[PDB]
């Protein structure tokens, strides 16, 4: 019923910036909240930023200040502005949409995109 397409991301030197995107598609659906997850090479998924349909945001410590989650309802798109990148941020980044109560509070996921932050030159 819901489809999440992720764009942006890739290879970038430290200190640089990235912008992830997540477009939501479907014949009809509701939105409770949308979140960005991240998964380091040898760890499980970690919710780093989340936003509700009303605009209320919320962040984890490791990203606070640097990362800015936002949403555009007219285009049903949700961004994560990643600033001051470090090699530790190297991970897979998944988009997440949680529907509201008209649906079963279903949780849809994107396939994931690679944010690779390298230290050396390019």
């Amino acid at each position: 019923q819901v489809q999440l397409q992720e764009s942006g991301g890739g290879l970038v030197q430290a200190g640089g910036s990235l912008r992830l995107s997540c477009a939501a598609s479907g014949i009809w659906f509701s939105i409770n909240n949308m979140a960005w997850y991240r998964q380091t090479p040898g760890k499980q998924r970690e919710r780093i930023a989340i936003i509700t349909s009303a605009g209320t945001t919320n962040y984890v410590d490791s990203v606070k200040g640097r990362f800015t989650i936002s949403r555009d309802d007219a285009k049903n798109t949700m961004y994560l502005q990643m600033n001051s990148l470090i090699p530790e941020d190297t991970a897979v980044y998944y988009c997440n949409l949680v529907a509201d109560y008209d649906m079963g509070f279903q949780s849809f996921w994107g396939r994931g995109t690679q944010v690779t932050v390298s230290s050396h030159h390019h």
Partner: peptide, 12 residues
Amino acid sequence: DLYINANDQAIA
């Protein structure tokens, strides 16, 4: 405010 349940599912 976010409310979490069984498996990390957050509902505002």
